[PDB]
């Protein structure tokens, strides 16, 4: 099984999935290795390879730090890369159904990991299942992350910024150039990714160089307009200058800085990445997308406002408990072996952790806004609230506002809300339907009866895979005609969305609209407070109210002690 | 709405404008406090 490409013939391997066969080509090179002088530059076109490359094993994963917070715990370790780290990492993997399709729709997977981590070789990204079940071709590639992907000195072609994004774009070009040899249809191309994959695809809707290489787009829990997604031009440059300082590369001009930085070991960069930002969050992106003038010719909200983007159909959705993953990575009191009941003061300290630079009135107002209890005292109130706070602030409403604004220009958008908690989740119950733990369902793992999932999870995964495949093929995420819930378009008026769980899928409207309304239409105006006052009358009131109630305490029993 | 008026709005009034009315209120608190010497001289 050998396929001739423009660069040469490539050999793959057959895998047996559900009684059928998929042909896998793992670790196909798509660019020149970014070593030496090519380190930090834009990607260079791959010229030619030597004889037939045996694409029968996963390649090295690209250099990244590893999550080691829970040694031996499957919940965290299943996302860490399971092969060697290296700078020579621009490779892709392709899974094709057997027998060969003649004009198949292609799904392109873009891993996430907050632009700092991730790899395409995770078990949860094995594309053999989707290829077996929906007879489509799936391709995924490794792309540079961190400073290596996004060190920015814009205008300088030695390190212009957004290199990882330009890697993605060149990979798309490679797909356009080569997919026909795999039996693919270059006019039916669908991109999908999560948390940073979705941000990237959404940026390809804005990037003129990306304007003609794909058809549709699926965005799982993410978009560029999230506050952590894109760094301003001069904050990026400042961070670059600071990394240079940390590494002994502060120089007169830019090219001397890069000359010394091209000689540093990847590990030195990795160990220095964490100090370029004075007060970071668990979602802080030290080096990420910016307005480079090439990929982003302007601030994304402005480009978005003017309708200058690819007019196509989109599929967008989120998980029920997006925010739960981050509290156990820094906030005091939380633990995966605890029930994590916290107090008001612990809550407030968590607020200070996730919102370091926000004014005091901002904290008071998020606190006030999130404590309108349905039922009290109810001990789990504050814990869920803080998780609910981070997710609301970071994810759902910007994603919805993006959908709203995209749909205002006339294209069909479809939104889902995944609400099922996996039966194999190793994390405690209180963390619910966690961030990133829908992907295994996206990839079809519960269809495999040997995997200890429930029948209901198989049924669910079949239904989402069917609707997804229909969306890919037709732009409409229907399942069947008759006895199937229709997925209506998301319109800015009704704002209908689809609930996703094993009991019953149904249509609801304006998910948590009042909270997200707070974050988009009130919260921006709170950083405009800017009033640093003498604080002495404020601290005086602070002592004064305790003076009041400590004064109250006296005559409670002064009258009795008589 | 009442949750807003009793539990948020007062702290919003806690910033705009700062003048000697706080010192007026401390004068009121000193007048609230100076009686407690006779409560200190209850039996003692």
């Amino acid at each position: 099984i050998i396929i001739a490409t423009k660069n040469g013939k490539v050999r793959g391997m057959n895998l047996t999935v559900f009684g059928g066969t998929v042909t896998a080509f793992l670790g196909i090179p798509y660019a020149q290795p970014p070593l030496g002088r090519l380190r930090f530059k834009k990607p260079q076109s791959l010229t030619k390879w030597s004889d037939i490359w045996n694409a029968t094993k996963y390649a090295n994963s690209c250099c990244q730090n590893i999550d080691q917070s829970f040694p031996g715990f499957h919940g965290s370790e299943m996302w860490n890369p399971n092969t060697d780290l290296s700078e020579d990492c621009l490779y892709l993997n392709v899974w094709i159904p057997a027998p060969k399709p003649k004009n198949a729709t292609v799904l392109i997977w873009i891993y996430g990991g907050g632009f700092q981590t991730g790899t395409s070789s995770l078990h949860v990204y094995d594309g053999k299942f989707l290829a077996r079940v929906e007879r489509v071709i799936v391709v995924s590639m490794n792309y540079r992350v961190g400073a290596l992907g996004f060190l920015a000195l814009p205008g300088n072609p030695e390190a212009p910024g957004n290199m990882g994004l330009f890697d993605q774009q060149l990979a798309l070009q490679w797909v356009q150039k080569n997919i026909a040899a795999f039996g693919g249809n270059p006019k039916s191309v669908t991109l999908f990714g999560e948390s940073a994959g979705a941000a990237s695809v959404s940026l390809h809707l804005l990037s003129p160089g990306s304007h003609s290489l794909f058809t549709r787009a699926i965005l799982q829990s993410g978009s560029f307009n999230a506050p952590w997604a894109v760094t301003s031009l001069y904050e990026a440059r400042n961070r670059t200058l600071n990394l240079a300082k940390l590494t002994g590369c502060s120089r007169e001009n830019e090219t001397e800085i890069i000359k010394c930085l091209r000689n540093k070991d990847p590990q030195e960069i990795l160990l220095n990445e964490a100090f370029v930002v004075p007060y970071g969050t668990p979602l802080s992106v030290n080096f990420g997308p910016t307005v480079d003038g090439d990929f982003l010719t302007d601030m994304p909200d402005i480009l978005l406002e003017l309708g200058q983007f690819k007019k196509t159909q989109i599929l967008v959705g989120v998980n029920k408990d997006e925010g739960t993953a981050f509290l156990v990575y820094g906030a005091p009191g939380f633990s995966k072996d605890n029930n994590s009941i916290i107090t008001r003061k612990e809550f407030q300290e968590g607020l200070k952790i996730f919102f370091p630079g926000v004014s005091e009135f901002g904290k008071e107002s998020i606190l006030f806004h999130y404590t309108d209890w349905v039922d009290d005292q109810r001990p789990e109130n504050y814990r869920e609230a803080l998780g609910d706070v981070v997710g609301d602030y970071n994810f759902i409403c910007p994603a919805l506002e993006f959908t709203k604004k995209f749909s205002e220009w006339g294209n069909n958008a479809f939104f889902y809300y995944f609400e099922h908690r996996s039966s194999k989740l190793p994390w405690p119950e209180w963390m619910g339907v966690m961030h990133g733990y829908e992907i295994e369902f996206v990839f079809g793992l519960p269809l495999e009866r040997r995997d200890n999932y429930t029948k209901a999870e198989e049924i669910l995964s079949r239904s989402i895979v069917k609707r997804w495949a229909n969306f890919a093929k037709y732009g409409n995420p229907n399942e069947t005609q008759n006895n199937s819930t229709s997925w209506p378009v998301f319109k800015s008026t009704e704002q209908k969305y689809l609930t996703l769980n094993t009991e019953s899928t149904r249509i609801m409207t304006k998910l948590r609209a009042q909270q997200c309304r707070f974050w988009t239409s009130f919260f921006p105006k709170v950083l405009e407070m800017t009033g640093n006052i003498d604080e002495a009358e404020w601290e005086w009131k602070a002592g004064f109210h305790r003076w009041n109630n400590y004064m109250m305490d006296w005559k409670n029993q002064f009258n009795d002690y008589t | 709405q009442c949750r807003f008026w009793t539990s948020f709005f007062p702290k919003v009034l806690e910033m705009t404008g700062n003048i000697d009315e706080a010192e007026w209120e401390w004068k009121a608190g000193f007048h609230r406090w100076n009686n407690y010497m006779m409560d200190w001289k209850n039996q003692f």
Binding site: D534, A536, W540, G543, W547, Y550, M551, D553, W554, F558 | D20, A22, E23, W26, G29, F30, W33, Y36, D39, W40
Partner: peptide, 12 residues
């Protein structure tokens, strides 16, 4: 007991 005392203000 006899109660905690008041705190005075800082004026500017």
């Amino acid at each position: 007991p006899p109660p905690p005392p008041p705190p005075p203000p800082p004026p500017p």
